[PDB]
Amino acid sequence: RVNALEQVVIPGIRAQIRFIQQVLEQREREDTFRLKRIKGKIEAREAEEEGG
Amino acid sequence: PVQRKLDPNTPFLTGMRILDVLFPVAMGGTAAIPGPFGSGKTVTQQSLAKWSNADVVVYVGCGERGNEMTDVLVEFPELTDPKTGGPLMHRTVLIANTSNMPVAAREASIYVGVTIAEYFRDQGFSVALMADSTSRWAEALREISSRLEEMPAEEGYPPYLAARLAAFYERAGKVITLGGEEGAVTIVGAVS
Amino acid sequence: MIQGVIQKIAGPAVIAKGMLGARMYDICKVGEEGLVGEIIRLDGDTAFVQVYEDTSGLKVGEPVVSTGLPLAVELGPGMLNGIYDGIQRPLERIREKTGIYITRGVVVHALDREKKWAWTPMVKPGDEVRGGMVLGTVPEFGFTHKILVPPDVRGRVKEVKPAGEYTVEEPVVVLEDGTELKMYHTWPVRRARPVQRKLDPNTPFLTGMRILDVLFPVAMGGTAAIPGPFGSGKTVTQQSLAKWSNADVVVYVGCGERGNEMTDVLVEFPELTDPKTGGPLMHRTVLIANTSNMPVAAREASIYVGVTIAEYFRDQGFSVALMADSTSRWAEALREISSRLEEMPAEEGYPPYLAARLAAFYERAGKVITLGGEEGAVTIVGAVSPPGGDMSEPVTQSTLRIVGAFWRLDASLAFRRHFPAINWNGSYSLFTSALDPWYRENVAEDYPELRDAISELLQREAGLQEIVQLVGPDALQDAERLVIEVGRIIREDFLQQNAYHEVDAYCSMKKAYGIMKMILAFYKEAEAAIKRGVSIDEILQLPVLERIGRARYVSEEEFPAYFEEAMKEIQGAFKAL
Amino acid sequence: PVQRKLDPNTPFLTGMRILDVLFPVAMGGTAAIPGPFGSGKTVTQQSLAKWSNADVVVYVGCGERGNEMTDVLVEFPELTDPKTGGPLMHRTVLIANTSNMPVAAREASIYVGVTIAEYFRDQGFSVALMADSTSRWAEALREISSRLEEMPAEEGYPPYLAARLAAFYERAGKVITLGGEEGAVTIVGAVS
Amino acid sequence: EYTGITYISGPLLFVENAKDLAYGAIVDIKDGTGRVRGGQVIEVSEEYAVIQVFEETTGLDLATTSVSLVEDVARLGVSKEMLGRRFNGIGKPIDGLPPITPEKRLPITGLPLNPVARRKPEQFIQTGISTIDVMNTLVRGQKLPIFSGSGLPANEIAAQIARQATVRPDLSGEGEKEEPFAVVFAAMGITQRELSYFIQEFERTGALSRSVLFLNKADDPTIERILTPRMALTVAEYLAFEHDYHVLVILTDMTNYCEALREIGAAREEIPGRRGYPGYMYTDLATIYERAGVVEGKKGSVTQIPILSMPDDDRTHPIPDLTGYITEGQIQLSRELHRKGIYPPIDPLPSLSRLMNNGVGKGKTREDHKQVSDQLYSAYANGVDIRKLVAIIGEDALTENDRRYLQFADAFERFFINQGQQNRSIEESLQIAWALLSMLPQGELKRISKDHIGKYY
Amino acid sequence: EYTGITYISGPLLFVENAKDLAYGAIVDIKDGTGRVRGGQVIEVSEEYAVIQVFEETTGLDLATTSVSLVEDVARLGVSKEMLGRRFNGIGKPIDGLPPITPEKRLPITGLPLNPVARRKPEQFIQTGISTIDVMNTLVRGQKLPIFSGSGLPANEIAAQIARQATVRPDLSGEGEKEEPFAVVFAAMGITQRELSYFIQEFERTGALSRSVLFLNKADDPTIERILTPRMALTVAEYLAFEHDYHVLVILTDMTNYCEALREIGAAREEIPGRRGYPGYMYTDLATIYERAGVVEGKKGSVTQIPILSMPDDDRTHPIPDLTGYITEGQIQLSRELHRKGIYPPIDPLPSLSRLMNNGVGKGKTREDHKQVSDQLYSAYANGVDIRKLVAIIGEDALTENDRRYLQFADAFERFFINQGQQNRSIEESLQIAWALLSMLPQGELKRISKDHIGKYY
Amino acid sequence: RMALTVAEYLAFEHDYHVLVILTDMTNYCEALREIGAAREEIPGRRGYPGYMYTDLATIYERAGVVEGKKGSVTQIPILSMPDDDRTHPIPDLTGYITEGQIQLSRELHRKGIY
């Protein structure tokens, strides 16, 4: 258990979180860039009432 | 309308040894039993089917998919009525909404079907309301965004959070009324 | 034609306005010098161009010329030793004339007009031709390049100019119907070549890797992946697949590759003997490779050029092995082009339009009978690149979205330098239900069983390997360690093949069946030998292991040296000693 | 601007054994103290400016604690320097910010302190800066940048986080100024 | 004509001077390739409109962009005989023959069934694996999604079920061969080898006859991967319900579905509400899946069996998601027994059957395997699970009683789940099964009744 | 020329119209606060062209502004006295002494390299840190990234090999007029520690007589970090190929490259997040690692020797991951041996040396160089392997065919890996390597056979 | 905010001593998000807002003693987490301005040790 723990176990179950975290977080890049662009549509549409 | 929110203190029973025993449910209550992505959470309505102590059953589903309410849906008129003897539909009302029924009807569903629970509960009844898998309501609520050119609340969460959920739940459940009758809505949320 | 100008410049892409008569997919030269891009999005009168080459130094306001005729490329002669690439320039020519430095920008003909070849006429005047036929052959090296009639076109023949070497330009067959058919002939890449009947893959492909084929098969028209985590084994496992082939044509697309990534690869081919000649391997190989420094859209375009060339050859009755290096190339093109052209994103910055070409490119893979009157196979064997190191990403699951064969190559195997790195824990094959006929037709009927009987070896090693890591080899008995140190020789001398001995980089069935039967014996004998209480310790010290172990330093002309010899010594002097 | 880059060679003493004797970082080094501030971590920070060979002390916050951020101020003059022989507050410049100060307080924080340190540097005086709550600085930056086109895009924080964090350390060291006087601009990095 | 383009790029178009059209309209487009390309007007817009072109555009000059309304409602004809003839997604035979002959033109979206008109399934069939006809006990009108990750075949192994399928008429008290058992198949996207492999496994039994195949390939329109299912299912309703046939629908390759779904999801106005697929996803998986269920006034049925190729062993991916809730009966295939070479390689650990005393195991479905199934669940659970729990606590901590549990895993899987072209009746199942339960004492036999017990002793 | 600006911003901004602005053109902007800037004109529009702001947003006004084109593209001088001199900084180099005359003014964008104008390696680099150049075989035909990792210094190691590369006529393959003592260093961004470290290192190595080190000086604006790489490069490409010399670009940490690069990607709204660091990364890097090959028809090369650290002692971060993929294989150092005292610590346990028998041979270096390549690797490997399985089953598991491989890891340890900073010839390394190959019985070795056994003891 | 502004006037200006006990922070933070999402402020990590910080400060920073004024408000906020895991904003944020933490044991609460 000592051998295992200090090799595969401890750092491995550590490093898993990281991978998880960073990819779910990274998904929310696409969220913002789209969300931006969604807003751009709402402001543009009202600027085709106030600039065209 | 009602006179005030009261504290429950009289249990409700499904006639089981785990949903009443180790962890009790209340009359005037609220509860939930999440079972991820289906896990035998629809079967707890074969336990509310003819073993409950609800004087008046009011079964509602947001927009449950037909196949899961094919055997459950026609199971009940066949079943014995503990409050009579014939069909279970002497006490059940059954105001269920399905995927077969409109896709917008699913969005309305909860905040409309609350009032049908309330008309009997007011009179002097201890109505048992169950919203069968509230996640079906979330799929309708979050679709609004898509069709309206708005994004939902970030990270796959619905835009309306508390606003249109909590209010239905706490709308009725052990509340003394204006007539001075006792209105108590018992829910066992069959969520995911 | 069409004379607009530029409006905006947007990265390697360029937009233009005043384009009337613009069609989706043409030659779209932007500016006076022209660069040759491609029309994707057409919104209004503004046909969004997406240039293959650099927009560096371009100043806005230079006339834009678009042909308005579908994107076509020259198919006919010159395939052998000609670069056509993705920017539509021969690197060959550039290399000498403008130096070892490429001047970015300016287009030159994809297929040089400086080439000249013999013509052997095979038809005569006053006939009625139909699409897909051959009009004449061209002997170019020790291979026979044919001139194929455009499919789905009919007309009579007016003339056919007699045999002799001429410039490719010269019209060799004038049709009565009014088509002066030049040796090169255009064909689009949006209009693809048809097939008379679709057929099932059934002829095997032999690439020169033992274990690879023997555990998880590949037919001609098959497909498999080559993952390579952290730029590992992958990069040169592909070199050894192309070094020797059983596929007649060799199509290597190394689009978007860099310096050292193609150094040895190419430069070694002029040193390999050719099967149909004996000089440079270039007499059967065609370079569609591109450089990394050229824009995103140049690596997109290269892949579509490959497959239409492959089809051309398939109709000539010639079997094509096509090997696109790394999907990290493909990914990166569409992954960036999405941002540019204001295309909205799907999953991981890749567009929802990713499988556009992809899907259709995998479909073409397969043994079929053409309309051409010949039968070939277009074999595709794409090398995947995991972005995340998981195949859950769409750029990686396309060889596991639709089923066929799939191979698993590991970093950990690559480190001791086991070539290939095939593992039997994430590889399956569907050409194990359709090579069974051709095996027992030519190969052997004692093969559909023997191959399997090797796989069970490493099946049973797995179950145990697990327990090796839970408790050592001193908790496990004689019979446990049995199939473990079978397993050992199946990998030590059967998953490692030397990349500096070229008679292990090519194998044959003779090399196959031989060394499969050696092990058969050992097992079947060893189950009784060790049952007499001879502990595995002693059998490790015997000379018997060492002699069978020479199998990655041996030749094929040194193949009858171990075939018959050691056969008797295995079943013989191991059951007494 | 400067006449030459220099390198520290002024001996390190902070008044703590292992602290400076095993790990020398010298004057014009750049340190850090990780983990959360408080719960025994205050020991180092306090004692540092009392003993340590610097002529001037600069203290600076940017999202500090409540009661703990005041314990320090109040005990500040009762911390005693031996050169000055009484109140430490004499050769200490305060510019500290807590979250009971405006939005943009914490975002403006750094640059201020950085500049003033260079003043002292110029007069041949070594300063002793303490850039506490680095982690928390960015809170503000993020908030401001939401409302803009400079949205978070890294890993939940600005990508311009990277520029102004870096540069903060690249302006601080031992160097020889234009007037030819040498000071030192040592940072202790409580990130939290 | 409506000239002045706004967007041109593959199957999705926009063209102006369009503000008065209907929902679903077959228009034409005169192309610059000279190939006349269709297109249904799925939505209408302010001063332009969305056309969703049936073929993929590869050249179309903006100077002459012709549009010509053929019909105001996109529909599809019908017939009563198409049996035995193959077709593609467009509606054209693969034999090169003429299409069906309209009788009436029905919408392609179709119209769903009332939940009240559905009545409990109970008429069980032989699928030719004892494993399904016991544990889940597949019945008419029911769905069995075959959960299968990537790197595990399911098109291949599905053909096995597809040829072993045969009604049960002597156990249900009445004929079921008296009303046609036609079958439907339909791919959303497949290769070259799997094309011929399918027909050659239908030609091997002559189960090819009386089938309607609405295949899709990967080189056939990418827009019609998701259009053609919806079409085909409303040609099912006609022969299944209104001609009273028992129609088996098998829809296989449900990722390639999702490929075509993706395209609209995000590129257009629609947003990706989970994993690049639209947020109208719910509908996109409702009209497809809802078709099936036994009628109370017809004696025909649509039994649909979706076969997935869902990504890896993930359960948060859209496919495993919604499919969970929907079905009651479901089965999983895994890769663990698939490399042993056993076919089918069932792994039923996350698998569930919520009907097995109610619904199936009553009526026309026999009840001698009622309590049997329920036994078999936990009996198999105790086996394979504890192989793990021993190698965790120590490596040996079983008694001799628990030895039996794992003694019965190894046996059961090999024999029971393995059939190639072997077929065993429900009774031939039971017999055998209860003789392998004899490797177990009481406590792994309580649930089984006094009747069943002795019956198969 | 364009007067007026309609956006004051820090990374990019509005410049009305365009009619002569090239892509990647040099513009000069007087901010009206007495300051002046430049930049590249990457993206040119007749609406709003946006120009590369070279410094922060402060110190800008609309009271006085002008935009004025200076040159078509980027350009800069390359002296033939560039070698033997350090030219710190960029544009006007401040190496603290006068700038050298821009003798040949040519572009600094990059000049591409034809893939058919390349030839297989034939040069070796004899560097004084034995361990690497023996096993990994440091040749110019590989460009392996050296990964330092956290709490492992990037500077010390890079510092080392600076003076410690030496040249022979034929122990290095090629001649000593084909390899000068000149080298080139190109910074991907230097930091506090990285600069305060190389200060002392210039006066000791000979950055005035054998080394060129272009820097960013650690305090110049962010955009400078996407300028110095390719600028540093092109310079050397000239004297290397055209003048004939071998030079090695010794990079520095690509972390600060990402850093600067990313801010452009969120101010243009590109793909700046692959897993928290750019998805567009590789596109710009095509040029850096394109010239890192070996030219054909000219002599002398350019080879990128990436040296980059990792933000965590795990590779879950894009930093080393995307680099792995781009380039070929890896060489590492880790912290296995660093915790105990060994210096230089070198662990090539998960390493991959792509080439190791090309660019060397027999007689190009030594006879036994080609053979002792793979040998050490697996001899040593299987040393550390034992210490794994001993502890799993009690505290031993070792045999007598273990006691020899065991001590082959001690013998390789402090005798070979540890060396100080002491120059070691390819002779002194391989010679004595064979007396450490006398700890396992010779004659029949894993990769060596009897052909160097009786020659080298 | 209501009783906040009244509180100032209770404990500092009457010399009284108040104890503010808030409960359920999850709701406080959900509702907040909806408001900010329409002012063009992007939500934060694990969906919970990033403009939280400022607003959460203003409730808690009317705590701490005051020179010469003996009476001051003691702050005790109570918030919920799935298992007291620190993998979302709700604790992080809080945990910088506030001092200490006092988490709840499953063992204890089972046995009825309160």
From Swiss-Prot, chain A:
Return the similarity comment.
Answer: Belongs to the V-ATPase D subunit family.
Q: What does this protein do?
A: Produces ATP from ADP in the presence of a proton gradient across the membrane.
Name of the coding gene: atpD
Organism this protein belongs to:
Thermus thermophilus (strain ATCC BAA-163 / DSM 7039 / HB27)
Please report the name of this protein according to its UniProt entry: V-type ATP synthase subunit D
From Swiss-Prot, chains B, D:
Which amino acids does the record list as binding ATP? 35-42
**Which family does this protein fall into?**
Belongs to the ATPase alpha/beta chains family.
Question: Which BP terms from GO are recorded?
Answer: proton motive force-driven plasma membrane ATP synthesis
* Lineage of the organism: Bacteria, Thermotogati, Deinococcota, Deinococci, Thermales
Q: What does this protein do?
A: Produces ATP from ADP in the presence of a proton gradient across the membrane. The V-type alpha chain is a catalytic subunit.
UniProt keywords, alphabetically: ATP synthesis, ATP-binding, Hydrogen ion transport, Ion transport, Nucleotide-binding, Translocase, Transport
Of the intact sequence, the residues represented are: 194 to 385 of 578
GO CC list: proton-transporting ATP synthase complex
Name of the protein: V-type ATP synthase alpha chain
Q: List the disulfide bonds.
A: none
Q: What GO molecular functions are on record for this protein?
A: ATP binding; proton-transporting ATP synthase activity, rotational mechanism; proton-transporting ATPase activity, rotational mechanism
Source organism, top-level taxon:
Bacteria
Swiss-Prot record, chain G:
> By what name is this protein known?
V-type ATP synthase beta chain
Q: Which residues of the full protein are shown?
A: 236 to 349 of 478
The record's function comment reads: Produces ATP from ADP in the presence of a proton gradient across the membrane. The V-type beta chain is a regulatory subunit.
Q: Which residues form the signal peptide?
A: none
The transmembrane residues are none
Q: Give the family this protein belongs to, as stated in its UniProt record.
A: Belongs to the ATPase alpha/beta chains family.
